[PDB]
Symmetry: D2
Subunit: 462 residues, 4 copies
């Protein structure tokens, strides 16, 4: 009963996935030796669950994923390779660790000719933008891992692939590392394709950026654990506010656009959520109000976590073509205010406080563990691209680093499994509809009556 689930992507490139789809494209040939390693691809089962010990276990699936690793032979000539980095889309903890590690691995391990950082996402690759490219060196990236955001900066909206490749050519780029999400990596493919049309010796390698941890073929993306730490700190605040008011409601919106991993993890980690609203589990304003009522039958406080992709069906694009969400944080808060107002009887006093800790989550520096994670991804990213990997992203599954072709990855998305342990834990700690309000509380205060008497004895026995 695992806690994630796969699902077709809103804009899938493949409708089915086969082993060939999973094979990673490589620039032709690998003639130089690896200074790092002063001999062939290893794989890992996509799914380690067996069919049919006995004679050796056979996977319930035919799929293998390529393991990322440093390689004996590499494709590019180390001391002559130029590496490029761009960061696109929203910001997320660990961008600067990615930037820094790519640079240092290039410079320290492979002793590359130069590292170029492109400004403000793909815009920095445009004819106009290219004038702002900077050269990244040890001194530039030494301390950037202490800061949120991206020193390169980022942007939204497309650029002309022909301009971008023009730029890559003019500057002598051999590897462009594209750090960003779904949009970014789709752009990567376009760039990669245009370079091919030209017969340019260029790897385009993706480092996946999604604070939501909704990437397919992945159990963890950088930034995500940090977002959970911060979200929990948001939740404590909301909890403080609710407890301080008779019929107090703390509503806090968390990141989840298409999935509720942050919302769920934070709900359980904090032990403080009473209602947890995720996109996987669309419910009506009436149900929410109903859960709130139940909560207010036995408590004077209620914390409601809501993922930003929840309740999009509750009412009525950006430069990149992404569908703008309606702010469910604001809308839900208003509906809850409405509800408690229309019931001034039952709830004499009552307060609703709303917290949107969005930017503080995304624009804050990485946890130590996220840093380590970023550095590992980035390091391996450089290893594989040096060995001519292209058209793929690096990811992590089953505690292993793998290579995955952009087409596969952008075709499916990870989603909460409502039958999973994580979501089962959210159901445990939150208010429940399916409980006789009466007997439920009756079996509460009795659990209490017991406890206090055990208490009373123990202390007399003093």
């Amino acid at each position: 009963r695992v806690t994630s689930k796969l699902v077709k992507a809103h804009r899938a490139m493949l409708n089915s996935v086969t082993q060939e789809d999973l094979k990673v494209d490589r620039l032709p040939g690998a003639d130089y030796p690896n200074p790092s390693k002063k001999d062939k691809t290893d794989y890992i089962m996509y799914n380690p669950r067996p069919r049919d010990s006995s004679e050796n276990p056979v996977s319930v699936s035919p799929l293998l994923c390529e393991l990322a690793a440093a390689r004996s032979r590499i494709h590019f000539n180390p001391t002559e390779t130029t590496i490029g980095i761009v960061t696109c889309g929203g910001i997320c903890p660990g961008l600067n660790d990615v930037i820094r590690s790519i640079t240092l691995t290039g410079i320290n391990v492979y002793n590359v000719k130069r590292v170029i950082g492109f400004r403000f996402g793909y815009w920095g690759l445009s004819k106009k933008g290219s004038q702002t490219a900077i050269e990244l060196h040890r001194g530039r990236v030494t301390n950037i891992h202490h800061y949120g955001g991206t020193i390169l900066g980022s942007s939204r909206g497309p650029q002309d692939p022909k301009e971008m490749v023009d730029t890559l050519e003019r500057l002598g780029v051999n590897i462009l590392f594209t750090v960003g999400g779904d949009g970014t990596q789709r752009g990567a493919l376009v760039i990669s394709q245009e370079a091919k049309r030209r017969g340019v010796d260029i790897s385009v390698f993706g480092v996946p950026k999604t604070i939501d941890n909704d990437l397919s073929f992945s159990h963890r993306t950088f930034g995500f654990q940090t977002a959970v730490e911060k979200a929990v700190q948001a939740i404590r605040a909301a909890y403080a506010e609710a407890v301080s008011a008779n019929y107090g409601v703390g509503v806090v919106k968390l990141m989840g656009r298409d999935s509720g991993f942050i919302a769920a993890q934070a709900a359980v980690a904090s032990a403080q959520a009473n209602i947890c609203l995720v996109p996987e589990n669309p419910i009506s304003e009436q149900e929410v109000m109903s859960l709130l009522e139940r909560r207010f039958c036995h408590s004077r406080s209620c914390v409601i976590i809501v993922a930003e992709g929840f309740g999009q069906d509750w009412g009525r694009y950006d430069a990149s073509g992404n569908k703008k969400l309606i702010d469910i944080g604001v809308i839900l808060t208003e509906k809850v205010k409405a509800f408690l107002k229309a019931n001034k009887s039952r709830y004499p006093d009552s307060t609703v406080k709303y917290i949107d800790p969005s930017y503080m989550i995304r624009a804050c520096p990485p946890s130590a563990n996220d840093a380590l994670f970023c550095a590992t991804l980035a390091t391996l990213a450089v290893h594989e691209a040096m060995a001519g990997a292209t058209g793929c992203i690096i990811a992590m599954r089953h505690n292993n680093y793998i290579l995955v072709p952009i087409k596969v990855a952008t075709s499916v998305r990870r989603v909460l499994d409502l039958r999973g342990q994580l979501w089962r834990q959210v159901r445990e700690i939150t208010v429940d509809l399916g409980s006789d309000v009466r007997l439920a509380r009756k079996l509460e205060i009795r659990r209490e009556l017991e406890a206090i008497n055990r208490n009373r004895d123990r202390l007399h026995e003093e």
Copy 2:
């Protein structure tokens, strides 16, 4: 010379302040000895000399708070009550906890009562929810934000409230909260006198803004600044990540800009700092932004919540609700950058409102110590029959100050002070030739880099 300034309160009770006004009311007589210690000392309101020994430029003296040899209430028979009212602020639980423990540990009082949800917990209805505070209850509450007692907005009937105080045997009510709260305390105190009730009403001032008069520091304030700065770094991260990126973050200052200002300087990251003391027009702000965007691709704008209330068009307690200047300013800045898509090709505005995260978060270690000291001294003085007053801190000393005085004046930024002078230094300036200013910038830079270039050549071999 100060970074603060005094100003008449929006609803002042005194129009002038005299020594007699500063005298603290005391329940008649002090017959019991102080178990803790098994006449009143003063401090000059103003330590600046006029014109042999220096003479204050002012006649005012303030009474120093301290544990007293003789006390008014009979320790082992006194009942203490605590209520928290108004908004929440870091340190409420440390206050609650310290009052309780000082009462219980030092004076060995009969009982401590905590009243729920502000003054509502003193109403006939509310009183049913009063709880008894004991060591076990308050042991660990200092680790949490908010108030375990809870708080509320809106008035109660002083006759009901005193009824409650009488029925429960309360000898001291500690009222923890703001201007409103302390005004309510006077009412309560007055009604208790009309009845000849032996009751002290003592205020522990609660203002996250640090805008209390006769005070240089109120609990929660330093914690607010730590948190604000953290908010500012986020806004700065967002701005730096975007070509012509603007991070707008709203901070607490309702009638004053101390938090805004301190956080601006502490962070080193603010480009524009908007406070109520210094009302400027949308056009001026846009103008400062333009100047910032002449030499930088990023701008962080701090705005206090009481700024720009004159830029456009009540709560249960009668407080005037503010228009959200964070939201309005953000929109105006969006409007401005949109209407200038030419000059600024790309451009982004991100708004952060860290309000509840600041107010509902636990105290720094230093705030905790501060809370405990205030609360401790509060118990000392009220045991010694002080009433109608608050405890406060001036010139590194704890003083007693009558509610009437304190609610008549408020502390405000002095724009001629060092703090504000530092805000002027670090932020964009209007009165600089945009051109020659940047010219003398990149030249400072050209220098630097060449010093750099030499140093590193002087490195090889």
Copy 3:
């Protein structure tokens, strides 16, 4: 980046599928109130038509079960925490209690004080009853509210206690020692025909448990360690020929040391037990560091350098303090070379207790709760003699005998350790040409800088 190795006191010399099978109290007649056969996962997902594991081993997946062995409303759960302290003990304690009380509505939960001592005839008088009100907020605190202890107790006394108190499940939270004790307790309870599950929640801040990629507390330890490293780094940078030496937890392995070294980006030398080197080699690395820098940060795991010189109540071998010894050797070295290093300072940081006695990261908390929750599920379903663990992002059940027979260790050929090699001083570099190719990288950079800024004026 890990590797398996025989345990210092192994119970099995080889591991077979049958060894991996988890013992279950006979029969499962009651329904699970929570859910108003066993699934497995390959021990090794590398392949040798559908892929075939390079290994025959399967591990049992932990999960809530349709049928359970104990009668929920009549089961009594007990908890004990033993050995050293580690971040997340209270989360474990709290989650076991709440899962028992909320999900299974068990009769009662008992907390035993000060490790196994609380199960002794004497100790048992101090047992307390855990209820929602008791555990509500303990996850905010380091340490263990139950307390812990070192040293054995009489298994007959302990089982006496379990019987007298009506315990149906004892959760033993702790390390290798603890779980070995658990088997003893479990065995004695069988000799008596007692209906008792003894289930282990593994506690090792080192992350050196076999059949496991992550144990609770570990990620928190790394956060804290990195904070220690920054301090050391601050101290080194503030002194001409400054050395910051900071000791980290690793007794038999170097996972914390290594992860913290890379996470911080600040370690110049990283000393782990997997890679024993001589005082002379360390001094040599330091010299190379001091050829191109005025600062050096040295991370050393506590199990390093035990061979550099000459027991506790539980029988554990006490280590010599390598932190103190190494610091002294480094002082000696820099003193004996006052010539080359005019000034020079050594500051030593031992952040040990601050690491172990501090509250869990949010992620660790989630992790603790999940482990504890599943632990309750499986023990309700009569699992015993085993621990819960996590491999390949999955929770599994593993018999104490297997787990205590092997240990996880750094693989020096792995990515983690390869990253430590990258960021740290290297022996095998021509000191000269290495620095020559340094300042040249620099000369370049500055000139790029100098142009960019000239191209700035006007």
Copy 4:
């Protein structure tokens, strides 16, 4: 009745202090206008009245620090120098950064020079490593502990140092450091006078201990208290986890106990607080511990590093090295509990020395603000030719104070003050009948629980 007290310094330069002593030396003349501001004000040393307007109980006035209309140095031609000496303390980089920026932004000075590794950077040899500080260099340093300039211990030749100041064109040297540092400053200032050099020597006081006279707060101090408290929680966690567990944590206080005391109260967790102001014997400490162990299974002992120096038997600068009381106290406590295995069956002592983590960690937001203000004012006054003095803060105001006065007295805990009175409250007390004290404890408890029991029945 305050919480500090004054005391003669171990190496006082004045035996009495008069108003003339308090007057701040100024380089002759002030002819240039202040670009910032496009006579001296004072404050009473003591605001308590004697006996119409109140008269100070003291004749002393202190000069208020402020930006001045006229300044002494020609702004666009002044060269500023910065050195940091002595131990490290949170806020050094904020000081460095603010001096630089105030110089560069406000006064538009010619150049800012940072000297490396304390006074050594001013020696003939050291001077070769001087670096030029500019906006780009100091932009982000406030995020780091330590000092980018670095520091050192041990004297240099004043003639060399002034040679350096002259050769480089320094008009103001800002000396950031302690007592030793500022004494060095006077020497440097004196030698420059002998030469008729136009040089201000201005001190920014550095003492993490908050024991500076004429001062209520020095930078770093509040940050130290935050960190110390965090150390204390760890020790508390360790003590609570062990039957008769003792957490001993050593804090910074060399000659005073402000950090120890503040941290003891702030944490609410200390049972015993040992400061230098209150020397007690091993027997008394052991005795307080016994009392603690009469009603509790845990004890946290805070000890300041200058405590217990009389309990047993120099550095490059001539400072007296302390015996490690942390280590010695821990041992004595171990001895004591060992020799009483009877009364305390089990028992553990865990010792935490969070020293470097406190000193080498970045400033709280409030400390940063403080550092920047001090530094800013420092630059204002030195531009207006103040010299031979330090900037300090008393009664929420910034004042100028001559090094001679400041190095002659030191701030010390007042055992009759509120702070120390609070330490007495929260800690174990000797002067309580062990028996009736606990009797009146559990009775307070018996009450409480019954109030509890009713409430919950209701």
